[PDB]
Amino acid sequence: TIVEGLVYRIEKGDVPKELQGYTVISLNFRKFTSGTSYRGEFETRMKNIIKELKNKKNKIILFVDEIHLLLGAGKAEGGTDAANLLKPVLSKGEIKLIGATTIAEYRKFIESCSAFERRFE
Amino acid sequence: ILFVDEIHLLLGAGKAEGGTDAANLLKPVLSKGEIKLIGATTIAEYRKFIESCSAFERRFE
Amino acid sequence: TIVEGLVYRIEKGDVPKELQGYTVISLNFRKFTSGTSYRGEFETRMKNIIKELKNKKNKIILFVDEIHLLLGAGKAEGGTDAANLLKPVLSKGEIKLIGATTIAEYRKFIESCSAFERRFE
Amino acid sequence: ILGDGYINDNHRRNIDFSNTIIIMTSNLGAELFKKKLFFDADNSGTPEYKRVMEDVRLSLI
């Protein structure tokens, strides 16, 4: 709802000039695990996304409900793991995402590989 | 109106897709009021939602 | 940024004469093992990188993001390549590579097998 | 550590303690540092109290 609170600031225009228009995109796991027809075809869906996440320069805001499904949980070949994409890319200012976790499981990101610590705020 | 014998029976199988049938699905769906579900669990079973899973404890009542 | 500094220092002229003109090839992990298809088409891509750029006289500099990422993915039995190749390259001087690891991981790189102890530095 | 440097762990690495200055502090100060040293703390002696301190220094050994 704080992230919902961002959206109402946008539609009423109560945002700075550099952040106007940009649309929040949530990420439901109705479609992440269900598209897994092959191993390579999982990342190609992201490749269609990420290439249009940089050269788009249009309304772009990424949102995750709980990052514990992204980088905490998951077999290394079962989908999203600690060896997920965009590890050196998200340090650069070319992708805008906003995530949310609970503290009591957030120590798993410290104990996953201890390398996403400087990768998030 | 849906009814389940045990929600613990929904924490078992669910293979050949990448995740458990109930532990993946219905997570933002049961967050809001859509489904008219009613459940029933053994008390001694029920500790696994509170201790082990520790996420659905606010989803159900 | 010290590795990326060196190319900013080619134009400064504070390089030795025998190390001039060379081009750093930055290497994303998305380029290595995403486009591989668990087949004998794998090693058709490995010679495109490795063996085509040894006897080629062109000016070459490699760069590894992390060596631990190269040990994580690439477990297909047919594919292998989890530090299997580049074994005479660590004593030959044709290929110029640069790696980067963190200390707490590089401690677990060396003493977990104790075979790469004399190769790397 | 002092006579060694080849400590086997559960991971069986070596831990060399070469080029290390080892610093071993503890007090033992009371029950000898009564007022003998204490009430003449101003000058504390070039001829006399050095002998008094070495006698205490011997008793710390």
CSV table of C-alpha atoms in Angstrom, one decimal:
chain,number,residue,atom,x,y,z
A,1,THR,CA,0.0,0.0,0.0
A,2,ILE,CA,3.0,2.3,0.4
A,3,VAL,CA,3.8,1.2,-3.2
A,4,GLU,CA,0.1,1.8,-3.9
A,5,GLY,CA,0.6,5.1,-2.3
A,6,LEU,CA,3.2,5.9,-5.1
A,7,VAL,CA,0.6,5.3,-7.8
A,8,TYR,CA,-1.9,7.8,-6.4
A,9,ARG,CA,0.9,10.4,-6.3
A,10,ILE,CA,1.5,9.8,-10.0
A,11,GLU,CA,-2.1,10.0,-11.3
A,12,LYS,CA,-2.6,13.2,-9.3
A,13,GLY,CA,0.8,14.4,-10.6
A,14,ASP,CA,2.3,14.9,-7.2
A,15,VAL,CA,5.7,13.6,-8.4
A,16,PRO,CA,8.9,15.2,-9.5
A,17,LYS,CA,9.2,16.1,-13.2
A,18,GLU,CA,11.7,13.3,-13.9
A,19,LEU,CA,9.4,10.6,-12.5
A,20,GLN,CA,6.2,11.5,-14.3
A,21,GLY,CA,4.0,8.9,-16.0
A,22,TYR,CA,5.9,5.7,-15.1
A,23,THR,CA,3.7,2.7,-14.5
A,24,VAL,CA,4.1,0.2,-11.7
A,25,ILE,CA,4.3,-3.4,-12.9
A,26,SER,CA,3.6,-6.1,-10.4
A,27,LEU,CA,4.9,-9.7,-11.0
A,28,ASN,CA,2.5,-12.5,-10.3
A,29,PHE,CA,3.8,-16.1,-10.1
A,30,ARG,CA,0.7,-17.2,-12.0
A,31,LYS,CA,2.9,-16.8,-15.0
A,32,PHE,CA,6.6,-17.3,-13.9
A,33,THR,CA,6.5,-21.0,-13.1
A,34,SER,CA,3.8,-21.8,-15.7
A,35,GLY,CA,5.7,-20.6,-18.7
A,36,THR,CA,8.5,-23.2,-18.0
A,37,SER,CA,8.2,-25.3,-21.1
A,38,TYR,CA,12.0,-25.6,-21.4
A,39,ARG,CA,15.0,-24.4,-19.5
A,40,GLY,CA,16.2,-21.9,-22.1
A,41,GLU,CA,12.6,-20.6,-22.8
A,42,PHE,CA,12.3,-19.3,-19.2
A,43,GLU,CA,15.1,-16.8,-19.6
A,44,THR,CA,14.0,-15.8,-23.2
A,45,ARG,CA,10.8,-14.4,-21.7
A,46,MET,CA,13.0,-12.3,-19.5
A,47,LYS,CA,15.2,-11.5,-22.5
A,48,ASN,CA,12.2,-10.1,-24.2
A,49,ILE,CA,11.5,-8.1,-21.1
A,50,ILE,CA,15.0,-6.9,-20.1
A,51,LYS,CA,15.9,-5.7,-23.6
A,52,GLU,CA,12.7,-3.7,-23.6
A,53,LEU,CA,13.6,-2.7,-20.0
A,54,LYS,CA,16.6,-0.6,-21.1
A,55,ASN,CA,16.0,0.8,-24.6
A,56,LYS,CA,12.4,1.6,-23.9
A,57,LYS,CA,12.9,4.9,-22.0
A,58,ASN,CA,9.1,5.0,-21.4
A,59,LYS,CA,6.9,4.3,-18.4
A,60,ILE,CA,8.7,1.6,-16.5
A,61,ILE,CA,8.5,0.6,-12.8
A,62,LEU,CA,9.0,-3.0,-11.7
A,63,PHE,CA,7.4,-4.4,-8.5
A,64,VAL,CA,7.8,-7.6,-6.6
A,65,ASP,CA,5.4,-8.7,-3.8
A,66,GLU,CA,7.9,-10.8,-1.9
A,67,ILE,CA,11.6,-11.2,-3.0
A,68,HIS,CA,11.8,-14.4,-0.9
A,69,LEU,CA,10.2,-16.3,-3.9
A,70,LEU,CA,12.8,-14.8,-6.2
A,71,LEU,CA,16.2,-15.2,-4.6
A,72,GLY,CA,15.6,-17.1,-1.4
A,73,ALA,CA,13.5,-20.0,-2.5
A,74,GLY,CA,14.1,-22.2,-5.5
A,75,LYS,CA,16.1,-25.1,-6.8
A,76,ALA,CA,19.1,-23.8,-8.9
A,77,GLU,CA,17.6,-25.5,-12.0
A,78,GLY,CA,14.0,-25.1,-10.9
A,79,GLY,CA,13.8,-21.5,-12.0
A,80,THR,CA,14.8,-18.3,-10.1
A,81,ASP,CA,17.7,-19.0,-7.8
A,82,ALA,CA,20.6,-17.1,-6.3
A,83,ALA,CA,22.3,-17.4,-9.7
A,84,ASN,CA,19.5,-15.4,-11.4
A,85,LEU,CA,20.1,-12.9,-14.1
A,86,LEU,CA,20.7,-9.2,-13.8
A,87,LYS,CA,23.3,-9.5,-11.0
A,88,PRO,CA,25.8,-7.1,-12.6
A,89,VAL,CA,23.1,-5.3,-14.5
A,90,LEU,CA,21.0,-4.0,-11.6
A,91,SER,CA,24.0,-2.2,-10.1
A,92,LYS,CA,23.8,0.0,-13.1
A,93,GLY,CA,21.0,2.6,-13.3
A,94,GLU,CA,19.3,1.1,-16.3
A,95,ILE,CA,16.5,-0.8,-14.6
A,96,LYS,CA,14.1,0.6,-11.9
A,97,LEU,CA,12.5,-2.0,-9.6
A,98,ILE,CA,10.9,-1.8,-6.2
A,99,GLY,CA,10.7,-4.8,-3.8
A,100,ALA,CA,9.3,-5.7,-0.4
A,101,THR,CA,10.2,-8.3,2.2
A,102,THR,CA,9.6,-9.1,5.8
A,103,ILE,CA,12.6,-8.8,8.2
A,104,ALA,CA,12.3,-12.2,9.9
A,105,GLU,CA,13.1,-14.0,6.6
A,106,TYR,CA,15.2,-11.2,5.0
A,107,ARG,CA,18.3,-12.6,6.8
A,108,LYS,CA,18.2,-15.4,4.1
A,109,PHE,CA,19.4,-12.8,1.6
A,110,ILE,CA,22.4,-12.1,3.8
A,111,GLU,CA,22.9,-15.9,4.1
A,112,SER,CA,22.1,-16.8,0.4
A,113,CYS,CA,25.4,-15.6,-1.0
A,114,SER,CA,26.2,-12.4,0.9
A,115,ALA,CA,26.5,-10.5,-2.4
A,116,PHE,CA,23.0,-8.9,-2.7
A,117,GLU,CA,23.8,-6.8,0.3
A,118,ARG,CA,25.2,-3.8,-1.6
A,119,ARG,CA,22.8,-4.7,-4.5
A,120,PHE,CA,19.7,-3.4,-2.7
A,121,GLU,CA,18.8,-0.5,-0.4
B,1,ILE,CA,-18.7,-21.6,-1.3
B,2,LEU,CA,-15.6,-23.9,-1.1
B,3,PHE,CA,-14.7,-26.2,1.8
B,4,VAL,CA,-11.5,-28.2,2.5
B,5,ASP,CA,-11.1,-31.3,4.6
B,6,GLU,CA,-7.6,-30.3,5.7
B,7,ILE,CA,-5.5,-27.4,4.5
B,8,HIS,CA,-2.6,-29.6,5.5
B,9,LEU,CA,-3.6,-32.0,2.7
B,10,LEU,CA,-2.8,-29.0,0.4
B,11,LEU,CA,0.8,-28.8,1.6
B,12,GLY,CA,1.8,-32.2,0.1
B,13,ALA,CA,2.1,-33.0,-3.6
B,14,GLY,CA,1.8,-30.7,-6.7
B,15,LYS,CA,4.8,-31.8,-8.8
B,16,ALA,CA,5.5,-31.4,-12.5
B,17,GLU,CA,5.1,-27.6,-12.6
B,18,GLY,CA,7.9,-26.1,-10.4
B,19,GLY,CA,6.1,-25.6,-7.1
B,20,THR,CA,3.5,-26.8,-4.7
B,21,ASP,CA,-0.2,-26.4,-5.8
B,22,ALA,CA,-1.2,-24.4,-2.8
B,23,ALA,CA,2.1,-23.0,-1.6
B,24,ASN,CA,2.4,-21.2,-4.9
B,25,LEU,CA,-1.1,-20.4,-5.9
B,26,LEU,CA,-3.8,-18.3,-4.0
B,27,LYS,CA,-1.1,-16.2,-2.2
B,28,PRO,CA,-2.3,-12.7,-3.4
B,29,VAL,CA,-5.8,-14.2,-4.2
B,30,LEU,CA,-6.5,-15.1,-0.6
B,31,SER,CA,-4.9,-11.8,0.5
B,32,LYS,CA,-8.0,-10.0,-0.7
B,33,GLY,CA,-11.6,-11.1,-0.3
B,34,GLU,CA,-12.6,-13.2,-3.3
B,35,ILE,CA,-13.0,-16.9,-2.5
B,36,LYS,CA,-15.7,-18.0,0.0
B,37,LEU,CA,-13.4,-20.7,1.4
B,38,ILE,CA,-14.0,-22.4,4.7
B,39,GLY,CA,-11.3,-24.6,6.2
B,40,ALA,CA,-10.8,-27.0,9.1
B,41,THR,CA,-7.6,-28.4,10.6
B,42,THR,CA,-6.4,-30.4,13.5
B,43,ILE,CA,-4.9,-28.3,16.2
B,44,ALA,CA,-1.8,-30.5,16.5
B,45,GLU,CA,-1.4,-30.3,12.7
B,46,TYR,CA,-2.0,-26.6,12.7
B,47,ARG,CA,1.4,-25.7,14.3
B,48,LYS,CA,3.1,-26.1,10.9
B,49,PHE,CA,1.4,-23.0,9.5
B,50,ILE,CA,2.3,-20.9,12.6
B,51,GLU,CA,5.9,-22.2,13.2
B,52,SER,CA,7.1,-23.7,9.9
B,53,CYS,CA,5.4,-21.8,7.2
B,54,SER,CA,4.7,-18.6,9.2
B,55,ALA,CA,3.1,-16.6,6.3
B,56,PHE,CA,-0.5,-17.7,6.2
B,57,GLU,CA,-1.1,-16.9,9.9
B,58,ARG,CA,-2.7,-13.6,8.9
B,59,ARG,CA,-4.3,-15.0,5.8
B,60,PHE,CA,-6.7,-17.3,7.6
B,61,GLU,CA,-8.4,-16.8,11.0
C,1,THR,CA,37.0,0.3,-12.1
C,2,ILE,CA,40.7,-0.5,-12.0
C,3,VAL,CA,40.1,-3.0,-14.8
C,4,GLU,CA,37.9,-0.5,-16.7
C,5,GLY,CA,40.6,2.2,-15.8
C,6,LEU,CA,43.2,0.5,-18.1
C,7,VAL,CA,41.3,1.4,-21.3
C,8,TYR,CA,40.9,4.9,-20.1
C,9,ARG,CA,44.7,4.8,-19.6
C,10,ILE,CA,45.4,3.5,-23.1
C,11,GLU,CA,44.5,6.9,-24.5
C,12,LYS,CA,46.6,8.5,-21.7
C,13,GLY,CA,49.7,6.8,-23.0
C,14,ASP,CA,50.9,5.6,-19.6
C,15,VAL,CA,51.0,2.0,-20.8
C,16,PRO,CA,54.1,0.1,-22.1
C,17,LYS,CA,54.6,0.0,-25.8
C,18,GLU,CA,54.1,-3.8,-26.1
C,19,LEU,CA,50.7,-3.6,-24.3
C,20,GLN,CA,49.1,-1.1,-26.7
C,21,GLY,CA,46.0,-1.4,-28.9
C,22,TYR,CA,44.6,-4.3,-26.9
C,23,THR,CA,40.8,-4.5,-26.4
C,24,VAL,CA,39.1,-5.6,-23.2
C,25,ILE,CA,36.3,-8.0,-23.8
C,26,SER,CA,33.9,-7.6,-20.9
C,27,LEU,CA,32.0,-10.9,-20.5
C,28,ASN,CA,28.4,-11.2,-19.3
C,29,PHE,CA,27.3,-14.5,-17.9
C,30,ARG,CA,24.2,-14.2,-20.0
C,31,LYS,CA,26.5,-14.6,-23.0
C,32,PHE,CA,28.1,-17.8,-21.8
C,33,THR,CA,25.6,-20.5,-20.9
C,34,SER,CA,22.2,-19.1,-21.7
C,35,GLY,CA,22.5,-19.9,-25.4
C,36,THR,CA,23.7,-23.4,-24.8
C,37,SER,CA,21.3,-26.3,-25.4
C,38,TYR,CA,22.7,-29.4,-23.5
C,39,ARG,CA,23.8,-30.9,-26.8
C,40,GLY,CA,26.9,-31.5,-28.9
C,41,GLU,CA,26.1,-27.9,-30.1
C,42,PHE,CA,27.7,-26.8,-26.8
C,43,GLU,CA,31.4,-27.4,-27.8
C,44,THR,CA,30.7,-25.8,-31.2
C,45,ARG,CA,30.3,-22.6,-29.2
C,46,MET,CA,33.3,-23.3,-27.0
C,47,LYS,CA,35.7,-23.4,-29.9
C,48,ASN,CA,34.2,-20.1,-31.2
C,49,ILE,CA,35.4,-18.5,-28.0
C,50,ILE,CA,38.5,-20.4,-26.9
C,51,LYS,CA,40.3,-22.0,-29.9
C,52,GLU,CA,39.5,-19.3,-32.5
C,53,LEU,CA,41.2,-16.7,-30.3
C,54,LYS,CA,44.5,-18.4,-29.6
C,55,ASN,CA,46.2,-18.7,-33.0
C,56,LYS,CA,44.4,-15.5,-34.0
C,57,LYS,CA,47.0,-12.7,-33.9
C,58,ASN,CA,44.3,-10.1,-33.0
C,59,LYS,CA,44.7,-8.0,-29.8
C,60,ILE,CA,42.9,-9.7,-27.0
C,61,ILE,CA,42.0,-9.1,-23.4
C,62,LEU,CA,39.4,-11.2,-21.5
C,63,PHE,CA,37.6,-10.4,-18.3
C,64,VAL,CA,35.9,-12.8,-15.9
C,65,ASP,CA,33.1,-11.3,-13.6
C,66,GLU,CA,33.4,-14.1,-11.0
C,67,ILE,CA,35.1,-17.5,-11.1
C,68,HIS,CA,32.4,-18.8,-8.7
C,69,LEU,CA,29.7,-18.1,-11.2
C,70,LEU,CA,31.5,-20.4,-13.6
C,71,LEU,CA,31.3,-23.2,-11.1
C,72,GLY,CA,27.6,-22.7,-10.4
C,73,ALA,CA,25.9,-23.2,-13.7
C,74,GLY,CA,27.1,-25.5,-16.5
C,75,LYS,CA,26.4,-28.8,-14.7
C,76,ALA,CA,24.8,-30.7,-17.6
C,77,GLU,CA,26.8,-34.0,-17.7
C,78,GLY,CA,27.4,-33.7,-21.4
C,79,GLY,CA,28.3,-30.0,-21.2
C,80,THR,CA,30.7,-29.9,-18.3
C,81,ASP,CA,33.0,-26.9,-18.5
C,82,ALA,CA,32.9,-26.2,-14.7
C,83,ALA,CA,36.6,-25.1,-14.7
C,84,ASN,CA,37.5,-28.1,-16.9
C,85,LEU,CA,38.9,-26.1,-19.8
C,86,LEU,CA,41.7,-23.5,-19.8
C,87,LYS,CA,44.1,-25.8,-18.0
C,88,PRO,CA,47.1,-25.3,-20.3
C,89,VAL,CA,46.0,-21.6,-20.7
C,90,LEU,CA,47.0,-21.0,-17.1
C,91,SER,CA,50.6,-21.8,-18.2
C,92,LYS,CA,50.5,-20.4,-21.7
C,93,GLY,CA,50.7,-16.8,-22.5
C,94,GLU,CA,48.5,-16.5,-25.6
C,95,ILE,CA,45.3,-15.7,-23.7
C,96,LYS,CA,45.0,-12.7,-21.4
C,97,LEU,CA,42.2,-13.1,-18.8
C,98,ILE,CA,41.3,-11.1,-15.7
C,99,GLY,CA,39.2,-12.6,-12.9
C,100,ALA,CA,37.5,-11.0,-9.8
C,101,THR,CA,36.5,-12.8,-6.6
C,102,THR,CA,35.7,-11.9,-3.0
C,103,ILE,CA,38.0,-13.0,-0.3
C,104,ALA,CA,35.5,-15.1,1.7
C,105,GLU,CA,34.5,-16.9,-1.5
C,106,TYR,CA,38.0,-17.1,-2.8
C,107,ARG,CA,39.0,-18.8,0.4
C,108,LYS,CA,36.3,-21.4,-0.5
C,109,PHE,CA,37.7,-21.6,-4.0
C,110,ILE,CA,41.2,-22.6,-3.2
C,111,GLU,CA,41.1,-24.8,-0.1
C,112,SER,CA,38.0,-26.7,-1.1
C,113,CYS,CA,39.8,-28.7,-3.7
C,114,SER,CA,43.5,-27.7,-3.1
C,115,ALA,CA,44.4,-28.4,-6.8
C,116,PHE,CA,44.1,-24.8,-8.1
C,117,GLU,CA,46.4,-23.7,-5.3
C,118,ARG,CA,49.6,-23.2,-7.5
C,119,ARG,CA,47.8,-22.1,-10.7
C,120,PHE,CA,46.1,-18.9,-9.6
C,121,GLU,CA,47.3,-16.1,-7.4
D,1,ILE,CA,50.2,-20.8,17.8
D,2,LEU,CA,53.5,-20.0,19.6
D,3,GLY,CA,55.4,-23.2,18.6
D,4,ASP,CA,53.3,-24.0,15.6
D,5,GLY,CA,51.3,-22.6,12.7
D,6,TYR,CA,50.0,-25.7,11.0
D,7,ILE,CA,46.6,-25.9,12.7
D,8,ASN,CA,44.3,-28.5,11.2
D,9,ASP,CA,40.6,-27.4,11.1
D,10,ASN,CA,37.4,-29.3,10.2
D,11,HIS,CA,38.3,-27.9,6.8
D,12,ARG,CA,41.9,-29.0,7.1
D,13,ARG,CA,43.4,-25.7,5.9
D,14,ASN,CA,46.7,-24.3,7.3
D,15,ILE,CA,46.8,-21.1,9.4
D,16,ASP,CA,50.3,-19.7,9.5
D,17,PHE,CA,51.1,-17.3,12.3
D,18,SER,CA,54.3,-15.9,10.9
D,19,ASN,CA,55.1,-12.1,11.2
D,20,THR,CA,52.6,-11.7,14.1
D,21,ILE,CA,53.2,-9.7,17.2
D,22,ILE,CA,51.2,-11.4,19.9
D,23,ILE,CA,49.9,-9.2,22.7
D,24,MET,CA,49.0,-10.8,26.1
D,25,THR,CA,47.4,-8.3,28.5
D,26,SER,CA,45.8,-9.0,31.9
D,27,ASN,CA,45.9,-7.1,35.1
D,28,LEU,CA,47.2,-8.9,38.2
D,29,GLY,CA,47.7,-5.4,39.5
D,30,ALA,CA,45.9,-5.5,42.9
D,31,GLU,CA,47.2,-7.3,45.9
D,32,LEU,CA,50.7,-6.0,45.0
D,33,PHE,CA,49.8,-2.4,43.9
D,34,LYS,CA,48.9,-1.3,47.4
D,35,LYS,CA,50.0,2.2,48.5
D,36,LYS,CA,53.8,1.4,48.4
D,37,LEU,CA,53.9,2.4,44.8
D,38,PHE,CA,50.7,4.6,45.2
D,39,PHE,CA,51.3,7.4,47.7
D,40,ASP,CA,54.7,8.2,46.2
D,41,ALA,CA,53.4,8.3,42.7
D,42,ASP,CA,54.7,11.8,42.0
D,43,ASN,CA,58.4,11.2,41.8
D,44,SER,CA,58.4,7.4,41.9
D,45,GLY,CA,62.2,7.2,42.2
D,46,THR,CA,65.2,7.0,40.1
D,47,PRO,CA,67.5,5.3,42.8
D,48,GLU,CA,65.0,3.7,45.2
D,49,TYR,CA,61.6,2.8,43.8
D,50,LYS,CA,63.0,1.1,40.7
D,51,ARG,CA,64.2,-1.5,43.1
D,52,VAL,CA,60.8,-1.5,44.7
D,53,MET,CA,59.1,-2.0,41.3
D,54,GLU,CA,61.5,-4.7,40.2
D,55,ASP,CA,60.8,-6.6,43.4
D,56,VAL,CA,57.1,-6.3,42.6
D,57,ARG,CA,58.0,-7.1,39.0
D,58,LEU,CA,59.7,-10.3,40.2
D,59,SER,CA,56.6,-11.1,42.2
D,60,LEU,CA,54.4,-10.7,39.1
D,61,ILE,CA,56.7,-13.4,37.5
